Design goal:
Layout: H1 7-11, H2 17-29, H3 34-38, E1 52-54, H4 75-101, H5 107-135, H6 144-147, H7 159-176, H8 195-210, H9 219-233, H10 242-250, E2 259-263, E3 302-304, H11 306-313, H12 320-324, E4 325-326, E5 328-330, E6 335-337, H13 346-354, H14 360-363, E7 367-368, H15 373-376, E8 392-396, H16 397-412, H17 417-430, H18 448-463, H19 469-475, H20 479-493, H21 504-507, H22 520-525
Antiparallel strand pairs: 1-3, 2-8, 4-7, 5-6
The structure holds chloride ion (CL) (2 copies) and sodium ion (2 copies).
Length: about 525
């Protein structure tokens, strides 16, 4: 990216908004990296909760991170740290440069330039948010010049100061960006920041800031006030059909209604060194065999915790359950249930699948169904066993509605009408928009504690496998408690000899695994750094 261009090359570019746009798109491109949303930040670093875990019984090979059994030297961790800082460098570079060029732009281009400034600042806020929530104690690298300083000069900032920096960035994007559907300045804003995404992300930032580890409880009110602006704008909503979200994201269909922050992956080929393709629907897909000349395989290493399945099966009419979880795989010839053994007929396999005491071993192999390529992709493209053109939802309006409900309840110490309306909008859509909502709605009469429990659960039903559960458990201060409780619950369910698979419980340590370590390579280069607790 721009980090490899010289001082002279950079001073000769960005002479108008079209040139500036090209550099801005390079900031966005950071997101498609394997170490960003192509794999690590989307899938790999979000496993090991009450809803999902990595495949297998142990911690070998790719299972080391999802089982929390990795050292400070783990390569993937260093790669994400480096990629975030690269994103930040690109954002900083763009901002520094456009500040010096905007004065020369035409009236039309100055307007676009402010939007682009807002987009870069929103991206920078997003990158710092990931850094601060995942690593805890990070460096505010505020200029490209700082990136070239001797690393003995680097110091970690208080998380409160990193949050304030993110907040300033997102507040500017909220002020400057139009809503996606109101925008008559940009020719296209597909998969780019607009006001709804800025407000939505700022809501999530404030909610997290209010939770663990910073615990600035004043931010619940800020989260709620921010979400209110977005909710009351009437500019965004929920797609009528939950399934449409998956159809859309698997087919490169941008719809700004619900999708606020979505990473687009697309290449006609995968024979280059920097093709913007990811692992979505592959590593976290439905298990699928390769068929020569027809289909690439999907490894489908993200497995669903069966106790989550059991809880969700009680709410029969919730249509999201079957749209979210695959109890099947694709063989060379058919869609087949995971529980189907060699002797099973369709009827016997169906009976085993429904009974919690049957075929328990194979039930552990269920996967998400949200990124079922065989089911959703309508077009032919490259055949590859590892990569795809499937997109990644980082932030949907439903998440923001649930955050609004959560934050209102936290701030007001109890749910109000707005909190109920926000959560019930999500429940109604999740039940297929029933004529009578008395069955799907959360009942009146809940108090602070019970509404809190309801909203925390709804997040699993609404957003399962989309990368939020672990960070939610962490900001709620219950990550270790939940891993431990999940281990017990699987043990109660399991009726066979031995134990059910839940390797993450063997290694997850309270006071350690709520953060990733500061990468050892960086510890070794920055003499003023302190490693995170218990790392
Ligand atoms: Cl543009
Ligand atoms: Cl998740
Ligand atoms: Na795509
Ligand atoms: Na048991």
């Amino acid at each position: 990216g721009e980090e490899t261009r010289t001082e002279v090359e950079k001073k000769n570019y960005m002479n108008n908004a079209e040139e500036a746009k090209d550099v801005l798109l390079g900031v966005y491109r950071t997101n498609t990296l394997d170490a960003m949303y192509g794999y690590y930040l989307s899938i790999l670093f979000n496993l090991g909760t009450d809803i999902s875990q990595v495949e297998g019984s142990g911690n070998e090979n790719f299972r080391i991170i999802p089982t929390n059994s990795f050292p400070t030297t783990q390569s993937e961790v260093q790669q994400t740290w480096a990629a975030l800082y690269t994103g930040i460098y690109r954002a900083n570079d763009f901002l520094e440069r456009i500040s010096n060029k905007i004065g020369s732009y035409t009236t039309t281009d100055k307007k676009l330039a402010t939007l682009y400034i807002a987009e870069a600042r929103a991206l920078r806020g997003m990158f710092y948010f990931e850094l601060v929530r995942r690593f805890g104690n990070v460096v505010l690298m505020t200029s490209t010049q700082m990136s070239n300083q001797n690393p003995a000069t680097y110091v970690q900032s208080a998380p409160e100061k990193v949050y304030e920096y993110i907040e300033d960035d997102l507040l500017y994007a909220c002020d400057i960006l139009p809503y996606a559907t109101d925008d008559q300045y940009r020719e296209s804003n597909d998969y780019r920041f607009s006001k709804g995404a800025a407000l939505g992300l700022l809501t999530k930032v404030y909610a997290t800031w209010a939770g663990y580890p910073v615990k600035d409880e004043s931010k619940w009110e800020a989260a709620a006030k921010t979400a209110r602006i977005l909710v009351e704008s009437g500019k965004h909503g929920l797609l009528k059909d939950y399934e449409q979200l998956w159809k859309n994201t698997c087919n490169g269909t941008w719809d700004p209604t619900e999708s606020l922050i979505e990473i687009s992956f697309y290449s006609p080929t995968v024979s280059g060194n920097s093709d913007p393709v990811g692992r979505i629907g592959k590593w976290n897909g439905v298990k699928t065999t390769a068929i020569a000349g027809v289909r690439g395989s999907c490894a489908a290493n993200v497995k669903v915790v069966h106790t989550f399945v059991l809880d969700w099966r009680e709410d029969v009419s919730d249509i999201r359950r079957d749209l979210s979880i695959a109890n099947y795989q694709y063989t060379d010839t058919k869609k087949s249930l995971w529980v189907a053994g060699a002797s099973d007929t369709d009827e016997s396999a169906a009976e085993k699948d429904a009974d919690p005491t049957k075929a328990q071993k194979n039930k552990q192999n269920y996967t998400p169904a949200k990124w079922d390529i065989q089911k959703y992709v309508t077009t032919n493209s490259f055949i590859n066993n590892d990569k795809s053109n499937v997109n990644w939802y980082f932030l949907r309006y439903a998440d923001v509605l649930l955050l609004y409900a959560e934050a209102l309840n936290e701030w007001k110490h109890g749910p109000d009408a707005e909190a109920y309306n926000a959560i019930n909008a999500v429940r109604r859509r999740g039940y297929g928009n029933p004529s009578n909502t008395s069955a799907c709605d959360l009942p009146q009469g809940l108090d602070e504690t019970s509404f809190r429990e309801a909203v925390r659960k709804e997040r699993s039903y609404e957003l399962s496998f989309e990368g939020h559960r672990r960070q939610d458990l962490i900001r709620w201060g219950i990550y270790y408690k939940t891993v431990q409780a999940t281990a017990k619950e699987l043990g109660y369910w399991w009726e066979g000899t031995g134990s059910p698979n839940y390797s993450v419980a063997t290694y997850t340590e309270e006071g350690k695994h709520e953060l990733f370590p500061i990468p050892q390579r960086d510890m070794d280069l920055c003499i003023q750094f302190n490693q995170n607790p218990k790392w």
